[PDB]
Design an enzyme around this catalytic site. Structure first.
Site, PDB file in Angstrom:
ATOM      1  N   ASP A 232      18.059   2.460 -18.414  1.00  0.00           N
ATOM      2  CA  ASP A 232      17.580   1.119 -18.080  1.00  0.00           C
ATOM      3  C   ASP A 232      16.405   1.106 -17.112  1.00  0.00           C
ATOM      4  O   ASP A 232      16.576   1.184 -15.893  1.00  0.00           O
ATOM      5  CB  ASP A 232      18.731   0.312 -17.496  1.00  0.00           C
ATOM      6  N   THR A 233      15.201   0.958 -17.657  1.00  0.00           N
ATOM      7  CA  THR A 233      14.002   0.893 -16.840  1.00  0.00           C
ATOM      8  C   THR A 233      13.896  -0.335 -15.939  1.00  0.00           C
ATOM      9  O   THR A 233      13.097  -0.350 -14.999  1.00  0.00           O
ATOM     10  CB  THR A 233      12.752   0.971 -17.723  1.00  0.00           C
ATOM     11  N   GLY A 234      14.698  -1.363 -16.221  1.00  0.00           N
ATOM     12  CA  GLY A 234      14.727  -2.561 -15.390  1.00  0.00           C
ATOM     13  C   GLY A 234      15.639  -2.451 -14.183  1.00  0.00           C
ATOM     14  O   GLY A 234      15.660  -3.366 -13.355  1.00  0.00           O
TER      15      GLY A 234
END
Ligand code: A61
EC number: 3.4.23.16
Lengths: 99, 99
Positions: free
Chosen positions: B25-27
């Site tokens: 998850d890059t967020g």
């Protein structure tokens, strides 16, 4: 581009004719922007995140240019903590994860 | 490997001797794992997302293997609906976004 993750992957987007900063969010199914006006019809929807559910306005088939790449798709507008580009549009711009 | 984003980027991880599925998850700034009774000292934390905040326990220097790649760092444990590998560990396994 190739984007590393030591910083938040924030990029400039262009939508409804306006520039904004948004977070590339591979953990988001959907694209969710903070409160703003967009033209045309919208549908009430609800979505859930880590802290529960919110109400959003669903706008379909909306053009957005994300870091120079064109997408046209569903944009949810509501009380997200930050503007997020989710997988529905990350796929359109050909974004992948690599390691 | 390369992971496209047509579906959720779930991969197998191992932590505290359990195997789990987790989002790359890059967020996510931090790594957030579903409730599990890990040994060791921890500190309370609140983290915010869509819907509001959840209360988590912060454990430091926890070894975690992600798709065969070793990492070690901070993991937050609490009532998240999904296991989330955040940027603190994504960088350790050499993960980038590419388009
Ligand atoms: C502040 C930026 C976003 C929220 C916008 C942060 N989230 C990570 C997201 O990837 C989250 C990760 C996520 C995934 C699934 C459930 C809960 C959380 N996805 C998410 O909210 O997506 C929503 C939009 O599309 C829908 O698809 C999935 C849920 C909806 S998070 O889970 O709340 C999160 C994770 C780690 C973290 N570390 C410090 S604060 C913090 C917050």
């Amino acid at each position: 581009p190739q984007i590393t993750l030591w910083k938040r992957p924030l990029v400039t987007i262009r939508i409804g004719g306006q520039l904004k900063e948004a977070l590339l969010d591979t953990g988001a199914d959907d694209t969710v922007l903070e409160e703003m006006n967009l033209p045309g019809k919208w549908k009430p929807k609800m979505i859930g995140g880590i802290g529960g559910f919110i109400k959003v306005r669903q706008y379909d088939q909306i053009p957005i240019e994300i870091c120079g790449h064109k997408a046209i798709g569903t944009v949810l507008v509501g009380p997200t903590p930050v503007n997020i580009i989710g997988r529905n549009l990350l796929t359109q711009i050909g974004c992948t994860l690599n390691f």
